[PDB]
């Protein structure tokens, strides 16, 4: 009747489940780190060489040549110091002045440092120790014979006209360099194949790093999702200490051991239940994925924390902590749980959902517009009109930045 609020409807909190959620929101790698750092005191809580082959790593390959090259002790020291602060791309990390300071010799000067670098500038490969790469591509072209045409045009452009090509400003470039029409592009292309980051070329090899935590294998539609068994932590109750407590003459001390053990059993069961709740949540998510992942991120409905926590009895904070730093390997592959949710929109697909791979493939088509110039946001809007889903140019710029696409008047290139 006469509405309002009226009295109706305390105790003591503890951070127990709170610390547990701190673990769950924390990633399982460091979460297991704590799990070990936890189970340590809880006593009831459970060839050498193979192939053994060394490698060059490039800089030592440079040193191999330096050893065969004639060099003095100060020359060897300067070259070695130059080698010490070297980047993967093969450009010089520190300037010549920093190298002169590192040599710490008044006899060592910038000119001697430059001479040492130049004698070692193009030994292997061309354009090593690029030193703010620019003269590096210059030395690379200089290595090429002048018999190659348009070498002069490319050289004049690289001399002091890097900015004109930086914005892809072909008209301003032609107006400045007086470069030939439809021919200066030839010098540009000869410059384009100039082995940039040539030192980056040596580096090629890596091992694998992604942890499948849950596995949905699309088992006969509506994937049979399953976590990783070995990755799931588990303790073993000290049954010896369980039998070392009651019979303890201090039946008090031993039964208290039993009580602490029972409490830890509760803790472990709660963690397992956290895993299982995450698992049933994963069942709902996999029901979603049998269409979304199967239709890919393009046909994916944006979901919310509210939406998922509604399907469960889990609290919104409960889920919000539960999935933090979680990733599962699927038929698609290893995919992060934090990636699962997405913001919805005002598109005229009849509904609200997220751009995602739609935005990515939109960037793809905008690039796929005539390679002369990047497609503007109006192109995206028309593409969406064809898609029948509402998208806006501010929204287009947003989704493009999400796909990290180049700007419309920055990605224009000579076809």
């Amino acid at each position: 009747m006469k509405q309002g609020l009226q009295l109706r409807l305390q105790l003591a909190m503890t951070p127990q489940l709170q610390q547990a959620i701190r673990l769950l929101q924390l990633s399982t790698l460091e979460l297991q780190q704590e799990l070990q750092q936890a189970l340590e005191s809880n006593p009831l809580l459970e060839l050498p060489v193979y192939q053994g082959e060394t490698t060059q790593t490039l800089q030592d390959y440079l040193m191999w040549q330096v050893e065969l090259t004639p060099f003095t002790d100060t020359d060897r020291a300067i070259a070695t110091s130059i080698v010490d602060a070297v980047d993967d791309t093969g450009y010089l990390t520190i300037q010549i002045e920093d190298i002169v300071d590192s040599i710490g010799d008044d006899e060592i000067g910038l000119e001697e440092v430059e001479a040492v670098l130049k004698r070692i500038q193009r030994f292997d490969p061309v354009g090593v120790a690029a030193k703010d790469l620019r003269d590096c591509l210059l030395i690379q072209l200089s290595q090429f014979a002048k018999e190659t045409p348009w070498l002069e045009e490319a050289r004049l452009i690289i001399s002091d006209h890097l900015d004109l090509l930086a914005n892809h400003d072909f008209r301003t470039l032609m107006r400045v360099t007086r470069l030939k029409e439809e021919v200066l592009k030839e010098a540009v292309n000869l410059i384009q194949s100039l082995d940039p980051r040539p030192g980056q070329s040596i580096q090629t090899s890596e091992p694998e790093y992604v942890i499948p935590d849950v596995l949905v294998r699309k088992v006969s539609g509506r994937w049979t999702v399953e976590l990783n068994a070995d990755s799931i932590p588990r303790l073993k109750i000290n049954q010896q200490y369980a039998a070392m407590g009651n019979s303890a003459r201090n039946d008090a001390d031993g039964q208290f051991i039993r009580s602490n053990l029972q409490e830890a059993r509760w803790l472990i069961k709660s963690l397992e239940s956290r895993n299982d709740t995450l698992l049933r949540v994963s069942r709902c998510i996999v029901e979603q994925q049998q269409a979304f992942f199967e239709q890919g991120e393009e046909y994916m409905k944006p979901m919310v924390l509210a939406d998922i926590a509604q399907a469960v009895e889990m609290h919104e904070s409960t889920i919000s902590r539960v999935t933090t730093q979680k990733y599962l390997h699927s038929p698609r592959g290893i995919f992060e749980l934090k990636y699962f949710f997405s913001s919805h929109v005002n598109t005229e697909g009849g509904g609200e959902a997220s751009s995602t791979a739609i935005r990515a493939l939109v960037k793809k088509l905008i690039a796929a517009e005539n390679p002369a110039k990047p497609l503007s946001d109006s192109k995206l809007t028309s593409m969406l009109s064809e898609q029948g889903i509402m998208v806006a140019r501010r929204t287009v710029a947003k989704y493009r930045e999400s796909l990290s696409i180049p700007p419309s008047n920055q990605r224009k290139q000579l076809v």
């Binding site: 020291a77 070695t80 110091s81 080698v83 010490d84 602060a85 520190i94 590192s102 040599i103």
Partner: protein, 50 residues
């Protein structure tokens, strides 16, 4: 790892003379050890000599 298997400050320095934290990454430091990490800026052979 840290205070454990394959630890810097233990059995020797890091891949380069560069220390583990990141300080002293050059040929300039001969035995210098960073405050952020103490690992002598040195050769990697002694990984088999400590």
């Amino acid at each position: 790892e840290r205070d454990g298997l394959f630890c810097a400050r233990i059995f020797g320095p890091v891949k380069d003379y560069e220390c583990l934290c990141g300080k002293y990454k050059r040929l300039k430091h001969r035995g210098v050890i960073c405050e952020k990490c103490g690992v002598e800026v040195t050769q990697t052979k002694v990984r088999r000599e400590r």
